[PDB]
Design a binder for this molecule. Structure first.
Ligand SMILES: Cn1c(-c2cccc(F)c2F)c(C#N)c2c(N)ncnc21
Length: 257
């Protein structure tokens, strides 16, 4: 198998192609390999250097198949740490949220939007450090200090911001903030609040009407729920920004040893 690397186990599939564990017969160093536009993805992957983003090691083409070598996350995904109908202990949810914001602030700072934040795309290293993975939908929204609005509809319906179903064009950053809000909801309640944030979605109307005696909102303590009230705001220019998320009372609440 490719160069010194043996492809010894599968970690995920479907998507565009498969992800393999690559143990180096020589050094025993273990990495991840994605087996697959791709030009643009590679170019974004080479920009990424942060502790909460999956590191890119290199690519080797071999006829049809490209091979993307990235940092391995041996802890699996945040999706596997969320217990259905329960979620996880509030202190673990807060730490993962801190790491997720650190990663999102980095991407936005280099003018990159991920566009598909959800628990399947948030992986853990062996010390339970969160890493944003899968840059196949990622795009430049800021270049030479000029912002460009996005127009492609993409992501996963339960995680997408409402403006992306309703507007011709929209700002990248509030879309990623919204999906972090759905991720925070899943961690604290082990359930997604709606199929999609459309006015024909009863659960979404129930939330705009502030009916928080229904699930999933009734499983969530008042402090983190006050933050979700500022994140899941339908008007993207009134929605809270990451600088202001970092001032939020629950965000700054001591919880974890
Ligand atoms: C499961 N998995 C993925 C993955 C991420 C998104 C979709 C998908 F299908 C995947 F396999 C990784 C990546 N990128 C990954 C890694 N780097 N290390 C360990 N396991 C991984």
């Amino acid at each position: 198998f490719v160069e010194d690397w043996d492809l010894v186990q599968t970690l995920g599939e479907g998507a565009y192609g498969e992800v393999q564990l690559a143990v180096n017969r020589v050094t025993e160093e273990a990495v991840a390999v994605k087996i697959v536009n791709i030009k643009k993805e590679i170019c974004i992957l080479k920009m990424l250097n942060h502790e909460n983003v999956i590191k890119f090691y290199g690519h080797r083409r071999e006829g049809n198949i490209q091979y993307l070598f990235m940092e391995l996350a041996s802890g699996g995904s945040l999706f596997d740490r969320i217990e259905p109908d329960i979620g996880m202990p509030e202190p673990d949810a807060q730490r993962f949220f801190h790491q997720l914001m650190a990663g999102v602030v980095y991407l936005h700072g280099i003018g990159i939007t991920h566009r598909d934040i959800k628990p399947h795309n948030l992986l853990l290293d062996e010390r339970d450090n969160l890493k944003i993975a899968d840059y196949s939908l990622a795009t430049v929204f800021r270049y030479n200090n000029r912002e460009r609005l996005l127009n492609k509809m993409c992501g996963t319906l339960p995680y997408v911001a409402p403006e992306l179903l309703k507007r011709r064009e929209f700002h990248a950053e509030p879309v990623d903030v919204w999906s972090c809000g759905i991720v925070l909801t899943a961690m604290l309640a082990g359930e997604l609040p709606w199929d999609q944030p459309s006015d024909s979605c009863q659960e979404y109307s129930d939330w705009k009407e502030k009916k928080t005696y229904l699930n999933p909102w009734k499983k969530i303590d008042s402090a983190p729920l006050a933050l979700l009230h500022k994140i899941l705001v339908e008007n993207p220019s009134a929605r809270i920004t990451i600088p202001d998320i970092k001032k939020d009372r629950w965000y700054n609440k001591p919880l974890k040893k």
